[PDB]
Design a binder for this molecule. Structure first.
Ligand SMILES: NC(=O)C1=CN([C@@H]2O[C@H](COP(=O)(O)OP(=O)(O)OC[C@H]3O[C@@H](n4cnc5c(N)ncnc54)[C@H](OP(=O)(O)O)[C@@H]3O)[C@@H](O)[C@H]2O)C=CC1
Ligand SMILES: NC(=O)C1=CN([C@@H]2O[C@H](COP(=O)(O)OP(=O)(O)OC[C@H]3O[C@@H](n4cnc5c(N)ncnc54)[C@H](OP(=O)(O)O)[C@@H]3O)[C@@H](O)[C@H]2O)C=CC1
Ligand SMILES: NC(=O)C1=CN([C@@H]2O[C@H](COP(=O)(O)OP(=O)(O)OC[C@H]3O[C@@H](n4cnc5c(N)ncnc54)[C@H](OP(=O)(O)O)[C@@H]3O)[C@@H](O)[C@H]2O)C=CC1
Ligand SMILES: NC(=O)C1=CN([C@@H]2O[C@H](COP(=O)(O)OP(=O)(O)OC[C@H]3O[C@@H](n4cnc5c(N)ncnc54)[C@H](OP(=O)(O)O)[C@@H]3O)[C@@H](O)[C@H]2O)C=CC1
Ligand SMILES: N[C@@H](CCO)C(=O)O
Ligand SMILES: N[C@@H](CCO)C(=O)O
Ligand SMILES: N[C@@H](CCO)C(=O)O
Ligand SMILES: N[C@@H](CCO)C(=O)O
Ligand code: NA
Ligand code: NA
Ligand code: NA
Ligand code: NA
Lengths: 331, 331, 331, 331
């Protein structure tokens, strides 16, 4: 039996849910041979209302180098980056839900990802299997990937189909805790693009640049546009696509007209749909946002780590696209 | 005594400071023969402790068309846009501190800015005179403009100069209420770019596009880089520049090496430095972030309105630069 | 027109309600010739959730000597005492709701009360008239005073009569914000005894010591005891009494059996009942606790101050009791 | 593996720390063949952010009779009393940190303390050994006992020694979670008196009355008085004393002048100093307040229980003192 010393970065909706999940499931952890011991939780207001004991809160950065694991769910890029890099350099693993960090600081983080030190299941579709799903998909070669990777805009478009307005729906989405701190990252496709980039690096090209993703959000959409779609037997969704074009991988995020009976149009939550050779057509769906959904993901990764498995590795080498089949109907 | 009927969008750091400033200054408003009456205040969560009366809180959008003024401080782009457009179409002015909205939705908002319906002093350097400063500078032809327009990143480089880390500094700026909800906007230079764009449009080209601003943040800077700069007699700052290159106006944001005696280097708050012909060299500095600082700007604009003056107008035409220029050296 | 510079000590349930009441009614204040300007609000957590703008919060003591008025609703004794004494010494008035302070630090505070610098209507029965009521009663000489001066125990006894348990009722009372920080002061009669002492000093003896009050709370009471009372046509209440005994004023707090139709048994809230010569029998009733009720009181006192009236003066000299008539049925 | 069924009364600083400590230490409990199961957690406000699961929160009293243990950390006297008595009558132990309850309701609780049903290590000096320390000291006959038993007022005098004010110091102690809800209990010596009483009953007289303790606080002390003490080679501390006078045990709390080299003067945490025959001179010091410190005590007692040991017993008889004594000089 040994102590698992955990440094937690961020004590918000995700951080808190993870804290409490780890202690609630400490009996599970003991079957893995460990007892969880939080060293501290980095936050901004150590004295306010929060679902973590006050004395564990740290309003200032603390030394991470005696941790066994760093868990991060701070949001942003450069600040978490500078906090996690010394831990990574010392060979301490990172479990993160922070898709922006990974997408936008890959030059610094890729070498540690390659050594199996970064676990990030929660960074795409929360604790819905996404990275694991593509790890198994690597048995086959991708032909096309399409996902609904942002819960806030899904929620908004579902509410707008029901005639509610953009602004009403966004407000609710923020209350449910789905939105990023700034909702612009959700509604302009950027959060989807961060996620798509991580999927591409796992499956098809370990150097895939976030900047190459062409992203457009849901700003031209209205309840009227959606009702007109429905009348054509279609649904409009924000879709994140990965596909070959003239010999290269291309990544896009955009609203798309889908047949109403397509798995992506129907799915209950976030969804990733793939066609691959030789497996065929596979998809996964579940909640893509929220405290508890994300904590599930982070805790999945902690069990992954504890069982002796490495983190999520980039593709070992860029793979050749098989199909030039750039699909699509935009809106 | 007539009602001045205000719809307030947002009840956060800025909206609350504003609401309370209005109440405290109600005497001053009686000097124009009005009494301020808030029709409602749009917020996400009517449950939080808030220095605004429960009964005025709205969790859902409310009709704006009986207002004499819409004051907006909700954040984002598309949602505030869709909420203010109907009021603007009806000839109701908007008072806003929302630089992202103005910068990113100018195709929709420009026509109403041109009619005098948009007041936005608080959108750049908060209640420190910036737009008014430039309105006066229109008496001359611009040669070059350089500003320190992001309060959060000034604060960070000032704190880093004294040896503090990035992460600490950032954390403290968030606590002071200076950071955008997404701090990445501050630290990658995007918020400065938003502000830069609005200065360009006011002064030299009413269609200047936000996408034309070239912007790079402070992510390569450490307490070491800045302390080496001090020993060369320099200060490093993030500077927003508008200057002539090849007969076109160029707009850039980047860390620059300043002589340490330069007004921009010696500024403790945000700062705007202009050279124009025939005035010469003029400079303004003051706080560029914070609830009260921002509320001052919004209230300055409410007084501007009530006095009979129109909003902030874009430049009446585009014109090329008079002289070829250049910013300071990068880092 | 002039500025009324206010230092507020405490930003809790009372402090916040008062802050917001002062700004909401600033138009009333302008008819008195003033505009309210808070210098700062002393609290413990300046960053947490609260119904006062964050920037006005002060987590540490601040200089009060440029205030025109100090308002205190911090709770406790020695800490507020040490904060207000320099202001009192400088001739700056105090408006307080803090009955413990006044009862237990009267040696230090009496000389300032005598000079008319202390306004404390809110310290007994909140903004229900109590001190003003006894100021008018001074036309007559007291024969007996009985009050129901603690809202928490009233609420508990009313709930217990309805069969709810002590512990259920207390919990609700704490949620409604009626209880002191420690409920022991409520349930053992001490808070009632603090209040009774202040009443005695106004009306009958300016040196009346808090230590001479004989106080016993509601700890022997149960729903059964109360139901047995009801069956006898009685109600049990915690009653605060002032009456002459062998030539001296005596003060007690204790549960008493009252006829069910007595004003004290019926009253809607806190109640003060007096028999006096020659006026006869007078009473007053209303809410004795709560944020808004207390803020009413403090704001009444601010208007009192602004109109040129002095604070609540102690009796100029101990008055001779007329009746030896020690009344009573205990329980 | 059997359920250890715990009813927790209180979910605040202490109850939360305890709840989370139990979860984190669940492995350790499997070594006694139990798994901890909380039947419910009594709280005032189920809405606050709290590191305890929503579904276990109870806003109203719940049946305790299926519990193996009641752990209480709700504060006050009468309400916890009425809630724990039925459990105690049913032979369910109580683990408590509530010194006021024990001190003030001993007529009801003594019989159950005598049967081994009450564990209260955390009631004096938190999880620092105090009751266990005295249980060992029963091997000798007490000559005299002197302790620094109030964490808040030590903290205040330590901070005042360094020039800080009372009010500042107090504010900081409240923030650290050291102060009773009513800080007056701390600063007028009453909390030390509560603790003193429990030490007397454990050691020398199982009926010692709380009302017999003579108690005076720190209200006459300033940074000036303490700095003058330093120059005489002395430290002033609030000291709780039990000593023989005229053949009876006397218990007092008061500021005392200590030689600066005395163990009591050099203690950074709370401290208990005893002279007994034939042991000699023994001393214990450690943290006497705080959530985690207190939770350690409660959990120590839960382990004591689970090992088969009974609670803390009162002294098996009263006995007179062996020697006439005397505390240090007052201030
Ligand atoms: N919400 C969701 O549905 C999901 C979010 N994510 C990701 O998880 C991460 C966190 O999201 P979420 O929990 O919702 O965000 P929250 O704002 O709820 O949490 C952020 C936490 O980080 C602390 N913090 C943030 N910045 C700093 C800083 N500069 N210095 C010190 N402490 C800081 C905050 O302190 P404080 O509380 O004091 O302000 C807070 O405790 C983000 O990367 C987001 O993209 C992933 C999946 C789902
Ligand atoms: N802070 C500063 O220094 C400055 C900020 N600004 C700008 O002013 C604006 C507001 O900033 P600040 O007050 O700091 O932001 P805050 O997040 O503190 O306030 C945002 C406010 O808007 C409400 N809100 C947020 N999103 C929505 C939505 N989609 N629908 C309805 N209500 C919403 C919130 O409700 P709730 O409180 O329930 O969460 C909150 O009251 C921003 O554009 C910012 O860039 C400008 C100058 C200075
Ligand atoms: N509740 C009621 O019904 C009534 C109460 N009163 C009296 O009014 C007073 C306040 O009561 P209430 O508002 O309910 O109490 P609250 O705890 O709600 O408010 C106390 C306020 O004082 C601040 N504070 C307290 N102690 C300190 C300290 N040592 N240093 C710095 N700041 C401090 C608190 O800060 P923070 O919020 O950060 O903790 C808080 O803002 C008390 O005297 C009470 O007896 C009178 C009539 C009615
Ligand atoms: N803090 C310390 O250093 C120490 C404290 N103690 C003692 O431990 C006990 C608890 O202290 P602490 O946790 O600091 O106090 P807190 O006020 O922080 O916690 C009190 C808890 O009990 C709940 N509560 C309070 N009153 C009632 C009531 N009448 N009915 C039901 N629930 C109630 C509250 O609910 P909610 O959270 O909804 O408000 C809260 O969860 C006290 O007896 C204190 O003297 C002992 C040693 C150290
Ligand atoms: N804002 C994100 C959170 C999940 O990563 C979303 O809506 O999907
Ligand atoms: N985050 C912004 C707000 C002020 O516009 C800044 O730092 O300047
Ligand atoms: N606890 C007090 C507040 C009013 O002063 C009461 O219950 O009356
Ligand atoms: N307020 C108490 C709590 C610890 O029992 C103290 O300061 O000691
Ligand atoms: Na996932
Ligand atoms: Na400005
Ligand atoms: Na009153
Ligand atoms: Na102890």
């Amino acid at each position: 039996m040994e102590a698992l010393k955990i440094a937690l970065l961020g004590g918000g909706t995700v951080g808190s849910a993870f804290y409490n999940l780890v202690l609630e499931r400490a009996e599970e952890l003991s079957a893995f041979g460990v007892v969880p011991r939080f060293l501290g939780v980095l936050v901004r207001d150590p004295r306010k209302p929060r679902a973590i004991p006050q004395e564990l809160l740290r309003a200032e950065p603390f030394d991470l180098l005696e941790a066994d694991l760093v868990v991060e769910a701070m949001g942003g890029v450069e600040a978490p980056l500078r906090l996690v890099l010394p831990a990574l350099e010392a060979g301490i693993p990172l479990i993160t839900a922070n898709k922006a960090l990974l997408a936008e600081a890959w030059e610094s983080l890729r070498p540690f990802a390659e050594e199996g030190l970064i676990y990030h299941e929660a960074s795409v579709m929360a604790g819905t299997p996404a990275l694991s799903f593509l790890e198994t998909l690597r048995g086959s070669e991708l032909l096309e990937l399409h996902g609904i990777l942002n819960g806030t805009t899904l929620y908004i478009l579902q509410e707008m189909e029901k005639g509610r307005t953009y602004a009403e729906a966004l407000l609710e989405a923020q209350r449910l805790g789905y939105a990023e701190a700034d909702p612009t990252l959700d509604v302009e496709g950027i959060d989807a693009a961060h996620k798509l980039t991580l999927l591409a690096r796992l499956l098809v090209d370990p150097g895939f640049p976030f900047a190459e993703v062409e992203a457009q959000g849901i700003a031209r959409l209205t309840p009227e546009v959606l009702q007109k779609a429905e009348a054509r037997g279609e649904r409009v969704r924000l879709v994140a696509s990965l596909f070959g074009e003239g010999g290269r991988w291309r990544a896009a995020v955009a609203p798309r007209r889908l047949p109403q009976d397509h798995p992506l149009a129907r799915a209950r939550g976030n969804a990733l749909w793939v066609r691959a050779r030789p497996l065929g057509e596979a998809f996964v769906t579940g909640p893509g946002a929220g405290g508890g959904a994300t904590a599930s993901g982070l805790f999945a990764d902690l069990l992954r780590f504890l069982s002796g498995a490495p983190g999520h590795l980039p593709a070992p080498r860029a793979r050749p696209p098989l199909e030039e089949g750039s699909p699509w109907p935009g809106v």
